[model samples]
Target: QRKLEALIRDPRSPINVESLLDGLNSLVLDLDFPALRKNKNIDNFLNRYEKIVKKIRGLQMKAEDYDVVKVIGRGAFGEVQLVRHKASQKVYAMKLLSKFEMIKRSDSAFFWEERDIMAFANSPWVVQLFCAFQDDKYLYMVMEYMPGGDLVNLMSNYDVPEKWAKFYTAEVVLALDAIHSMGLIHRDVKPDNMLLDKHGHLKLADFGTCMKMDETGMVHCDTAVGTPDYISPEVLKSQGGDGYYGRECDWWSVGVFLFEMLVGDTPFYADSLVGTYSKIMDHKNSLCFPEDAEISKHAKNLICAFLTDREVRLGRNGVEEIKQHPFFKNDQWNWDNIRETAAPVVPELSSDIDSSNFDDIEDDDVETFPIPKAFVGNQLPFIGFTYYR
Candidate 1:
């Protein structure tokens, strides 16, 4: 009875009404309670159970359940909008993906993967996913709305002091470690993916390019995916070789991100994409700081530690190696309770729908994706996509 009650109360329990109902019914029969079934009290309890099960079977979320407020962001696969759930009257950021486009380019559409990571992450460092549902034309993922803009927007508007940079970088380390602990690698770790909450704390988002690693902490991919500036050397090399790379690649991107944070630009940036790739391949010679730059020696050393060969990289041993770095060592630093600490920049919001932090998306700024005509197997691929929390 205790175990059964626990399962029913567990929010993470799989939502299979039929299977759960069958299990419950079998438990009654297994107890051999023939006389109990005929009892008035037993019949009342059974009727109540069936009513609850029927109510659960009818529970489903739909696109019409939310009232769209504004479009906040647009990407290749979809657009994110500010919305309010009608029943709950709670604001949320809803990601809407074009099913036609996703079906046309299935290789790049990682909607299911992104949903899984957001739904199960359950970490303060990661953005929270409230629910997901689908429609005839699009799939929708509703998530916690972040009022503060992304890290890149902050950096472009204001200089990130060394102290604040260290704070932010430390949080990134924790966020990366959180995902890594679940045997997953966040392929994209640039500042653009680092979103700040209303309290100015960072929460990692955009898991579209993330991949699950095997038990050996490695994944195989034919194509390298991530922002060009933050892509790792090993990830780029995987395209030609045996296509195997470990979680170390994420740490390398963090190295690049750290360098960019301090110096105000990416280290291996070049005029052409090919030139940047070549510089990354030949990082030993290309990786250098400007003579006039005022970055600290310890900070430079930490960046070098991450940009080194994968085998001897700073995070190859584990996140402990990265956390123990001298750059993060300070009297004010609190690794244990970093989230509770006050942030460097808190966003001022006038209302729940205040979008001052994000850039205004003009009508002309929208990119168009041609929707393919309906086919026989168009909806088949998106089966089992609906979910709720």
Candidate 2:
């Protein structure tokens, strides 16, 4: 505590430097101090130093001021890079998109929709979007960086305990409720899109594939999107027909997420996309639960409700009812205080790379991106924009 206090008081101390530098300096200095050297408390000191450095760096990286480090993840439309701010030294996940590519691909509407979706979503379980910028060739969106990475990685490590599953599923349910209330459907809710922050809190991300509903209250989504294992029956059957399906499809995907979280694999796996679609159409078939898996009956009941036909699925009741289910009886988890209570199944930050290294900007880059001129002084819309559903 004394060391932390000193570090806090002197923010400019050399200890505020990078992890490698701080680690080395601490080791050298402690070796010279007889008292400290005899105790060999180097590991504890290094750990504390790393945490303080990360906190300081995060504070330094403001909303817009940042440098790109390295590509952390990528997709067909864009890529996410780790970034740091010049002044605050804080880190963030910066998404890069090429405007020319978006226009050529006729995905400009989707781009705008992403901005609109992010502008209103403000929740711990939802990835925080600080701002969006654009340049001649690409668009840049600054988002909160989740150091723990994604839920898929967590599932791969261990058979998710029932308590943890219940905790995470409840968070996603609340996020979906918020998204659905905005008259939009996530349409995609696989493990990849779900992220975990440093404290292990779940964050719903990757809104690129999200679709906006029309004025007639219809969601014309013809594209067969979303991951193969998580896609719903309605999406598979929408070949050439009207694009929209009932909001219940999102609930179906939630069911799939829950099953996969506890079981460590998807219920429906196929050699080909065609086979997956076939299994989706036959919704009555349920994934078999392992005999040795320790799960509650209420938990199974809730999963069954989510996977059941649209007529009987959890629907709007899914979010609240799941929270109140008996499976979560002992856990009694609270979403509002998840960061403090929930135990993360993954590490808070990765060691392979640091986000600061990517924030530097290079001259002569054709992107020449500037922050979006549209949102400079404009206030976001209220009715059509808020994600309260």
Candidate 3:
């Protein structure tokens, strides 16, 4: 084991490190001695054993392995950029997060949850994460670049017809179901977070606000954590005591998105944030469409089903409820092979780095924050935050 570690550390060595680690792991597993075993030699063996295990687990790519190409999306704390692997030359969308901001506002940041979900989510509708690594200043998540950009840009450019709305809404349903099935609730499910691939298929992104459900498939959140225009009443209620919600909140957001697609505006939209929250609080009456609007009956029905009470919400039973809705049935929807079908919007790209699908933004400068003088630590809060594949 000592020799294996030495060889792994040596940059000049050309050994198969994975095979060596596997051999070391098998040897360690073979020593299944008594649980209460004790001695200086045993202690020393255990010490080396733990160190080797950590070393093996910590084998991951570094931030410097990728070269930044262009800044695509920017947020308050960090930005998402296009990057290419130094050796493989594979293009990827890399999300860079400010460690200082995450550490300061730990509750809202949810860096670890985002990392875990993006890393482990095995679904066609969710964005694929290649790897995640952190440096002193920023944490990086390398993901597959979606050249088609996001749904917001698509909606901004074209008025989504009802036929196209059905396609996108059906995709969103599958995406949300995939997330909910994994015992997670995506608190934020708006147009901005839904990205399109080169094929115009949707892939859910931006999981910074997602939360894991409890054993009972519910979560008690004392603070609302979603976009104001799409947030459900139950999520707002969760800010008070004895308020717990499940995956129904996600379906509500979908309803708002569907409403916007069909009517070109959200159901509970208002001029002010407080007005929006008030309308959401009274969504029983506020969620009304324009009488002159020409939304189909089935579309209105599904949106109403989702915007209703949480206990009797459309997706409260499961995604099957939404899947079986008449809105989707009209299109002869094939739930099993939706991704294989023709997409409404196929992005045009001249090259791998053609970011024309996204909106233009100015070059982002490296930000500086004021950390207190008393605070001094070496990535203690972000230990064991390395992953591959």
Candidate 4:
């Protein structure tokens, strides 16, 4: 008890709580106490400790050895940098959160929630966590670096090939499936949050607005958050209601992404935000499909199911059902083969671009240089992570 109390009170202990708990749990679980033998109180404490330990350990392991190179992107919380490891030379995306900025914005909870959610998610389609760490000024998170950039960038270039869109969509759906299985909802699922690895595999990134279901399997989140175009109607219409929408909302956004991918424009875009909201609330489906667009009717039908306004639109089974749609029926794309296959396209820049060019820019500005203003802000938290050294 004395050692436990001492460890808890230590400033560094919070970062190493998992190790402490593991030691404590092992000691308590194997104890041969006569009077307290199999006591429910002891058992309960052990269980609670174990849960806390796992959470802490997850955070620690998630942020291990990563060296920040240049800023790849930025958000309201801080910035993300393109980093490489000293030993392995493996590159990663490292998000840097300013503690000072978080306190100023009063968004510390946002950091904690992102860290916890990322720790809970363990899927190939989901962005991988290398580690995280913090200093007085910043909290750093090292994650899998997707060289293909974001889905929005791909769409901006031109309408993505149907095969490429289908391939990417299928990967994201599987990722959402993994998140849903863990009883969490990715409240923010948009093209900007979807990243493509070197091999063209899509990995879901960013979890600033994810929600975990409670005992009743309900997740009540009323915050008017997420990207403007991808925000679901139920989220905007919540009016402070405690309705707990399941993981289906992610699929709805997937529908929006699919439509945008095939058609090259958002179906619900307006000249102004309010106008956009009005159209969303009206639930208009006036999608202007290009006359020359070479996509199949079945592809459009699958997208329609995703955008349907029904209560359970694109639920778990709904998502699975679309995977078998005719468009992808003959597609030989396989998720398992992604790591083995070369990306359909790679960024043209040299991997060995002179580091001296980056030396002039502030470390924080490197990530955001290429990314536009509309995509910057909302840095995620880094717990249980260490510095590059």
Candidate 5:
């Protein structure tokens, strides 16, 4: 292992970085699992290069720098395309959001907020936005490619096994904790939004609907963001017109995601999104666990606990309290070392440039809409445009 590490340290070495990493990957397979207990050596061995992944070299890169591939996914805010770096030949997901669409909905500020928010969250559980720059008509951000698609598709066949569900939920809790620690709320926390990496580990994505918590604490600012099925009851409830709620709304969504992963369907769901609204507002906190779905009591207790009125929610105290819930007590999970833990599934990754796990779509030919010269340089109002440790 030290020999393999040396190859990376000596840049002039005959062995290339890829060969060194590949050798390490092979060594990781040969590692004695029993020897890896309670130590981060294995984790660091895999992710040591990640420390330098920050501070993107191409900050003002032009669109031409990336050779855009097929469209892999689309969202309300933008489309995600598979792209390759010209110089490094690295595969990445390039998310493109229209500046025109942003200004049209007056979501321009929130559009930029997504970039900075992603920068703030540096956890493996969340998708890392490496570098961001703006073109005349659109905003661009480069990030890791999750070849495993998303949880929604993975769960389409049937509910994942309880063990799979448990691993995913645990990873998500860490992901949420990572963001909420930064006083950020991931309003959209559904299965579709929960992307899976090649190892099938969860990496939360789609921050276009994210909101910042008030400096004092979790304050209310509700415009009813997020998907219908995972919408928290508190978000549906009206506080006069302002709709006062806090980050607890996110905990509610997490509960729904956990339940769906275990049960194959959201607890509060219907035929259509419109039909799901009434169920979303169902504050009775009625959970529907199928009779045949053999959910353990401990998992049941936590799910029900999290899916209640926001005032009495499980995470109302803090994410740590939720982490201590009895459901997770059975396992001595290395919460901080999730990167090394075995994921529920592993997408067949053929190569570094593999696109087999993703579905192909026609290229997006949308026209770019540029903002006026007057509005171009007015980004200062959106404070904290850059993120720091």
Candidate 6:
């Protein structure tokens, strides 16, 4: 301590406040600093910064490095496979996207955007991306594996109780608030993408639809590109209305999500996608709670607050404003201790390698068989895309 203070005290020592902070940050992430490395205060740091946790050491890892467990998920452009590292025996989910398919559907741009956002959107409520690699056939992203599957499964198996629904939704609010603070919007926010870590804590996943706020001080998007049941009114009426909406759309989706968790059905839905969207636009009147269900008045008020008026929504004014509601104040909730707190239903995992929660599927090759030559760019765009902890 004296040596470090002496450097700051001595004008010619080439050390100042800036140097000290940087040195401390470097020490905080260092493996030798036991207390700093175990500091619980940093688990929630988001946005662009000197990131903590890990360093990207080697980049030439291949499919041979991991033992494929099973297909955890499948998307239009890719697949998420639960894999176990051969060397250290650590488990991770590997996301594979076909470059040929991207080019065929003209969805190549979203491919890069998802990678860029994943590199920055670091938060406890968000999944951690460890590394990125590419081969002749696919682009790969290896990330933390959540054994507890997704919220869609939890809500689907049975009618979830109100207290559990309240707990999960509150955590999501903090998660979205953290992302919004980073100036990036999660354009896609729904139960299907909400994952639970082994501890049963919520970790929001899937950033393919994420959009960065404009650099010109305006954060708005015109593309009508989200699930119909959760899509905000402004996003649907872009052609007839103000032409765009901002980060607030995510909150609307959460409102719908929260409603679904408690009710086991969306606040607005119909036989057809068009009818569902129509109900979403008229969510105020379309909103209904089951008479037999035990939804509290405070919960009803909170839902009503978020389900109406995109301009004056509960979180439109500020995230803290939404938290300062009766619904969240039933008792003291610990944001930091939530990971250690008991989840409603922890997945039955025999071991870390057990991926029984995920359904295995036959690997189907898509149109993107041989990745197109256009996306075979040199290591320029993907530079510094790998990390380890």
Off by over 4 Å in 6: 1-59, 104-121, 215-218, 222-224, 239-241, 369-389
TM-score of each: 0.82, 0.68, 0.82, 0.71, 0.75, 0.76
Write down the lDDT that model 3 would get.
Answer: 0.77
Q: What are the lDDT figures for the candidates, one per model?
A: 0.77, 0.63, 0.77, 0.63, 0.67, 0.69
- Tens digit of lDDT per residue, candidate 3, span 102-144? 7665554334664465466668888888777665577788889
lDDT of 2 at 70: 69
Clashing pairs in 5: none
208 Cα displacement, candidate 5 (Å): 0.9
CA displacement after TM-score superposition, residue 144 of candidate 3 (Å): 0.9
Alpha-carbon lDDT of model 5: 0.67
As a whole number from 0 to 100, the lDDT of residue 2 in candidate 5 is 72
lDDT of 2 by residue, 1-389 (tens): 77875763452333333323334433333333334434446445655665665564344323347776667776455777888866667777888765435544543342455545555656555788875544224456787888776777778777778877877787787777777666677778888888877666677885576667667433655544677899877776676655457567788888888888877667787789887777778768646678877557877787787887666777755466656666555545565665567464646454534432122333222342234322221111110111111
User: lDDT tens digits, residues 27-98, model 1?
Assistant: 332222444456676666666675664454345577778898888898666778899989999999988877
Per residue, candidate 4 scores C-alpha lDDT tens digits across 189-208 of: 99888886665567887645
Error of 4 at 59 (Å): 19
The alpha-carbon lDDT assigned to residue 173 of candidate 4 equals 79
Clashes of each: 0, 17, 0, 16, 0, 2
Please list the residue runs of candidate 5 whose C-alpha ends up more than 4 Å from where it truly belongs after superposition: 1-60, 107-111, 157-159, 238-242, 329-332, 363-365, 368-389
